[model samples]
Target: MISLIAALAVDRVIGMENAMPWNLPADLAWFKRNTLNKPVIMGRHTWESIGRPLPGRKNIILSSQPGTDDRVTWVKSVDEAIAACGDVPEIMVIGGGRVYEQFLPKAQKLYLTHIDAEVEGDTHFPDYEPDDWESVFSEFHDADAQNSHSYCFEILERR
Candidate 1:
């Protein structure tokens, strides 16, 4: 069940200045649900964006930095991060464009939240061939006073 996950704007924009352009709670909740008890692999910048290791899951950081803690492991490459997951039935690749680009080709599944609006951003999700994947499930949500953005979650599996 190896997977890649991200909240992408309709324009394919993902980030700006090391942070998500929008603060959407439902999207974060969705991320927590999927990754709570799983190993999450992310790039150095992504980890920095997050500020700390997420609780209840193994945090594998892809970076040149050297260090370790009870909850986190640092690796120099994407392959090394995946290898660190070892026999885990599902390893999730969390964001920062470079990390997603590295794992997109090898990932068996993608959990994407399509943000209904577009915004200026410096980072973008990698372009992928649509023919190589199939959408297995999707759920839509409408925006309100609390949730500032309308979005749709789609699960895509490699074909």
Candidate 2:
């Protein structure tokens, strides 16, 4: 299964200054819980933002330049990234906007955290037809001491 995961605001804002615009620990936990132990594909900027290879998962980075880490595999193209995944049952496409846009059409599943508030950001999630996806799982999380914004975790399967 090709899966894409992200946390975006109501306005589809994802990032500002190459980092998340909001501080939501709940979303972080949700991201970690879903992506752990999977083969995750990301663009170079996403890898740069993350700094190190994610522990316990095969990190496949899409970049023209080679990566120095032995733990992380670098591929130049989207096709190469998918090929690098090999026979992994589920390939998770975790991104920094552009990567998500590239994989959106090919993705079979989406694990999205929808933030309630609209915020200013340069990066935005790709637009997709809501009717083409079926929500299989959904849970709402209210704003708390650890999280600034209320959000909903939704797992959708391509229809």
lDDT of each: 0.89, 0.89
Q: What is the C-alpha lDDT profile of model 1 across 1-159, one tens digit per residue?
A: 679999999778999999787888999999999999899999888888899889999999888867655468888876688889999889999978998998888889999999988798999999579999999999999998877989999999999
Each candidate structure's TM-score, on Cα atoms with residue i matched to residue i, is 0.94, 0.94
User: How much RMSD separates candidate 1 from the native structure?
Assistant: 1.4
Which 10-residue window of candidate 1 scores lowest in summed lDDT?
63-72
lDDT of 2 by residue, 1-159 (tens): 899999989788888878777778888888888889889999888888888889888999988887777778989899999998898889999997999999998999999999998778988889679999999999998888888778999999999
**TM match of model 1 to true structure:** 0.94
In candidate 2, the residue pairs with backbone N, CA or C atoms under 3 Å apart (3 or more residues apart, or in different chains) clash, namely none
Tell me the lDDT of candidate 1: 0.89
